Amino acid sequence: GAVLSFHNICYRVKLPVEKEILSNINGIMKPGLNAILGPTGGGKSSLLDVLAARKDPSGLSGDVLINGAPRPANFKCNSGYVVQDDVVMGTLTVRENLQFSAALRLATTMTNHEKNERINRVIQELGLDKVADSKVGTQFIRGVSGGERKRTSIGMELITDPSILFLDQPTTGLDSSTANAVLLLLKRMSKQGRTIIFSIHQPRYSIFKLFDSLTLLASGRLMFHGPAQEALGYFESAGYHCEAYNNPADFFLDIINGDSTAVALNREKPLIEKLAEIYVNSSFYKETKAELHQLSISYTTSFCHQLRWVSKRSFKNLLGNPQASIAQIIVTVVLGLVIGAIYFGLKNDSTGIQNRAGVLFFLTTNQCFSSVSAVELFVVEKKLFIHEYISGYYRVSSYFLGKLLSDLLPMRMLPSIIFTCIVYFMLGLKPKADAFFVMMFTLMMVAYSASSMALAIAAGQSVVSVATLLMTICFVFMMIFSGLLVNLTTIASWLSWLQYFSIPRYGFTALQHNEFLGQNFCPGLNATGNNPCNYATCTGEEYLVKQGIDLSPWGLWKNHVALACMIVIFLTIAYLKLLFLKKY
Amino acid sequence: GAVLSFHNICYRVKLPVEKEILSNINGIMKPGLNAILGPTGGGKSSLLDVLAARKDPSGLSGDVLINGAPRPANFKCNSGYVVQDDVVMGTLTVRENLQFSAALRLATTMTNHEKNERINRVIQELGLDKVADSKVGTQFIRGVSGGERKRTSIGMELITDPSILFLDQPTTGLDSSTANAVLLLLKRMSKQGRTIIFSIHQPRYSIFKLFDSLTLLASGRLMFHGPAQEALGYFESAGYHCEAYNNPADFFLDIINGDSTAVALNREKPLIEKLAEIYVNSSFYKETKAELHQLSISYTTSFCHQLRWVSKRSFKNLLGNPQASIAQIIVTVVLGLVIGAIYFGLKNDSTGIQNRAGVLFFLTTNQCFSSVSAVELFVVEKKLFIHEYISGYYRVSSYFLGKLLSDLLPMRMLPSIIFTCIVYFMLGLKPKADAFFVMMFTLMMVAYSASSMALAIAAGQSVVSVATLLMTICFVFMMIFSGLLVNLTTIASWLSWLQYFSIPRYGFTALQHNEFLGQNFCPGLNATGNNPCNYATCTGEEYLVKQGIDLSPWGLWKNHVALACMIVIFLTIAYLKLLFLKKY
Numbered sequence A, B: 001g002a003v004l005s006f007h008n009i010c011y012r013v014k015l016p017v018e019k020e021i022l023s024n025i026n027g028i029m030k031p032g033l034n035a036i037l038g039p040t041g042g043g044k045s046s047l048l049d050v051l052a053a054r055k056d057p058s059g060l061s062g063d064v065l066i067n068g069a070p071r072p073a074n075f076k077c078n079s080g081y082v083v084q085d086d087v088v089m090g091t092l093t094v095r096e097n098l099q100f101s102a103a104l105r106l107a108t109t110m111t112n113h114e115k116n117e118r119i120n121r122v123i124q125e126l127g128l129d130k131v132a133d134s135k136v137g138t139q140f141i142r143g144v145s146g147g148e149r150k151r152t153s154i155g156m157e158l159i160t161d162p163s164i165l166f167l168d169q170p171t172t173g174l175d176s177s178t179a180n181a182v183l184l185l186l187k188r189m190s191k192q193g194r195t196i197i198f199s200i201h202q203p204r205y206s207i208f209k210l211f212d213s214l215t216l217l218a219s220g221r222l223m224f225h226g227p228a229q230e231a232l233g234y235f236e237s238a239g240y241h242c243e244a245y246n247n248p249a250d251f252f253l254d255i256i257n258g259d260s261t262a263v264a265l266n267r268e269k270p271l272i273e274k275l276a277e278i279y280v281n282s283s284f285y286k287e288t289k290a291e292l293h294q295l296s297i298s299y300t301t302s303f304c305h306q307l308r309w310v311s312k313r314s315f316k317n318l319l320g321n322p323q324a325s326i327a328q329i330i331v332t333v334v335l336g337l338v339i340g341a342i343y344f345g346l347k348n349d350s351t352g353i354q355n356r357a358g359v360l361f362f363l364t365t366n367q368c369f370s371s372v373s374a375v376e377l378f379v380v381e382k383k384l385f386i387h388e389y390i391s392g393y394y395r396v397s398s399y400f401l402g403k404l405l406s407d408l409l410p411m412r413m414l415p416s417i418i419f420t421c422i423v424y425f426m427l428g429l430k431p432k433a434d435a436f437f438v439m440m441f442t443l444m445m446v447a448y449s450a451s452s453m454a455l456a457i458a459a460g461q462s463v464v465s466v467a468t469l470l471m472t473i474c475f476v477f478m479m480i481f482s483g484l485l486v487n488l489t490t491i492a493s494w495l496s497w498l499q500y501f502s503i504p505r506y507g508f509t510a511l512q513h514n515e516f517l518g519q520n521f522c523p524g525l526n527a528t529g530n531n532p533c534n535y536a537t538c539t540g541e542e543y544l545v546k547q548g549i550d551l552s553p554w555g556l557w558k559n560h561v562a563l564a565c566m567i568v569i570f571l572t573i574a575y576l577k578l579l580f581l582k583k584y
């Protein structure tokens, strides 16, 4: 079994002004069933996160050791922490959240049939049969109840059968009889060699009798640590006799909570510093410190497996709630028909180039400005990314590349195929076969490059309010330098370098070079040359010399390798902002 | 006291496929302390929402009566429902959330000093002294603990001292001794004449002894309803003897949960239809039905008070987290300096109108496209709007107009003053005094009209993913008809009506009419007229005849009364989408 031991643990929280949650706390947690009792605000979820390595070590001032050695990297893939406030995806099912947790935290030596046999066993043992095929709720659509959602959270860190298993108040939300059935499940599990550390509120006498070790927190300090059967005979030595309470756990927390103003105002030298001084001078502390001095990433499943379940769950959220994907395709068809109907029948005239170079401007600023909806890709599920990463489901790179494929394909590839097709059979553009697909490829690359900049601003961010704001104002900053309203050659030399950052400048140049190769606009002419008066712009090559575009075939694909470099750079910034995010 | 009585209550949930949560349930809840026990998934939070009038009545099939009369409108302003999952604003403080609840749910006959004396009393009686000046946490920044946040939720519906008081598991998250101090607070409160209906998990014997009425739910059906002191002698008549359990509440839920597969697999004609058949044939049901047949908005505080606290709390969220407001002003100054530096020194030349009519296009598409950040105004706090409206804090109209003022002033008025000032002393526009403020007023009206359309799409919506998407694609739909790239007169008659919907068409016309009054561009001329060749566009009035703009002073302010009509219409749609939202 695993012997988790923690020695001189302190903690601090900067509110600047530091506050000392968790003063000097020492303890050993052998393989068994290790309970942590104490009042509200005593430091139980803060101790249980230090022991599970989920607090920022800038404020932590001790060391936690498993079997006398420090933690491996290798620890979130071998332990389980059930959180208190039930972080579970509410667009999936109780069975589907258990199928997702078993698919990424059990090895693939187990087949998919043997994993679902262990998922069916956990649903039976936790009492989740009537709601196994029911949706866990969100905060707007009611679903599975609060105690049934609690046991879903217990079960996801229980199919994975880790050796060290942390639970943050697992019976909070359960009644008197399911809570006994949960701790008899854990007591059966702890006799296999697992160490189970949990905090608990209000255990009954059938639950308190199951404990192997007892830990009493109060206002950050340790009131008692040792065996649970020897705790009642400890407080009788300190002057507190039991029999006014048939439950010892109801007696232990009336001692260490007597100084509370809620208890002093209702039916009724400090008490904490008195009871903490008794414990340090006791024999249970001398037994612990004499053994503490004697004692003193390689994920479970591969990259390609985690890629095929992060994306698989992400397509099920889009096939289950297709509001943003259906409304994407509707207003792309409607906008594609309007742009096709205004510039219907493009002619070769003195005003046939301003129509063609004006229709290609709204094709690029569609694909740029429509990519502001990619800001919400990593923000809406930030809390579940932070939870499932520190629980060890996936690499960041498999969450990153698996969540791209559910924003790349349904939202940026497919509305650039449909939008290119609609404005091709009703505008009368360059009628060749290859220039259709160069146009289709160009509108995808400005949709990917502007979506990658939506991800680079918004990765690892809690609200979309700042990132949507910098997304649209950087676009109108790039829409100046696109080369339509203001001439790029007439811009002074100290501002003409900002045209290389514009996503619309590379897309609109690549659509001008694709279309205005040798289309002729002056024929229909009279004897002497044309006789309108700018003078004229006869061929399409003379329009590109005026704009400053290379007539070579490199002048087309210079614009696509510069958009491909803005995808690699902006998706590396977006990756590293998820990687170096503080998950604590 | 208030005698809440509920008669033939049924409920259904459409998952389509209907499921019958809450079969036939009958009961009377006299003034006292009315507990609801039962297993997880038994229907306790569903019954407690039917009784508090918070379920959709399309699935509800009974009637709830207070004192033999139905509910008034007047009920959320006279009752209190403490929810289970702790809906509390985590950018405020434990004291500030209690100060906000007392300011809107107590009358203004009480002064602000007497309200804070009752807030200090509730903080003492609930044990919130050490965290009264500490921030309630969000889900990303840890703050106040889970039991300390629970008692903040208890205390906000307890300063308001309602006569009927519902609590959804108030001791879930509390230990053995604070939970006794909470129900001794409620027992002291119930002896003043208040009826207190609550569901509870795991009450100890000190808590169970306080009950005045007991209700036992199991799988939607009623196992027992009556006095709590007469419940133990009820199950002894049905064949269940007590003394293997020193706690009666631990004995009551081992009977009605024995058929659970969690209990059958751990240490161990249906049981529910057996125990429900005993209760209907019993005498406690005959006493209830013989009395059920015998028995069978005007907000607390005014509009102007609720307006001055919804906005007051909303400015404190912007002064506490000014990320989107500082980053608004930074990229407005930076964009205002770039637009001023590209078109620096506007001359009166053959190309001096394309510079002036091209700089006014990016001034309007700044103010339009920057208003996509107003999509998140009503979405980020949708859950707290739905909670605080059914709890009776405010009208919708005071939440609507109070949340506008924290998006109108810091985000749309102030970055339109700064942005007009910057591009005025470095472009060299119309140098008069009134044309500066007509320009400033025009950029505010396109910022308000495009923000009002951001609210009309996004009011009452859970994610911003659809509403940001329709916001930016409707803008590029309106940017076609603005009258810059494509001539509005050359558009065919069946598409030339879409120019009246464009916010950028009214702003860019009002900036062209403001600036191109009689500015002259042709002087500097030679003997015969000008000698470049389009021919020329000499005065600014000839440019407006070509664009199709009235030269009258009505031709300016036609554009501002049409933007003011798009504020009134889009903020009426945005109001009614919050009003007719389904809050159940």
Ligand SMILES: Nc1ncnc2c1ncn2[C@@H]1O[C@H](COP(=O)(O)OP(=O)(O)OP(=O)(O)O)[C@@H](O)[C@H]1O
Pocket (backbone or CB within 6 Å): A013, A021, A038, A039, A040, A041, A042, A043, A044, A045, A046, A047, B131, B134, B142, B143, B144, B145, B146, B147, B148, B173, B174
């Ligand atoms: N990051 C933090 N910021 C502010 N306060 C904190 C932080 N961490 C802990 N605290 C404070 O420390 C105390 C202990 O917190 P903790 O959540 O560990 O208590 P707990 O025993 O888990 O409470 P409960 O059992 O009610 O959940 C709380 O009162 C909390 O206000």
Ligand SMILES: Nc1ncnc2c1ncn2[C@@H]1O[C@H](COP(=O)(O)OP(=O)(O)OP(=O)(O)O)[C@@H](O)[C@H]1O
Pocket (backbone or CB within 6 Å): A131, A134, A142, A143, A144, A145, A146, A147, A148, A173, A174, B013, B021, B038, B039, B040, B041, B042, B043, B044, B045, B046, B047
């Ligand atoms: N709107 C709904 N959609 C789906 N299922 C529902 C809905 N309302 C209730 N249920 C189901 O009905 C059962 C009763 O729900 P309820 O929340 O009332 O139980 P509860 O006794 O409050 O549970 P707990 O005490 O654990 O919170 C639950 O199992 C839940 O799955």
Ligand SMILES: [Mg+2]
Pocket (backbone or CB within 6 Å): A044, A045, A168, A169, A199, A200
């Ligand atoms: Mg805890």
Ligand SMILES: [Mg+2]
Pocket (backbone or CB within 6 Å): B044, B045, B168, B169, B199, B200
């Ligand atoms: Mg309940």
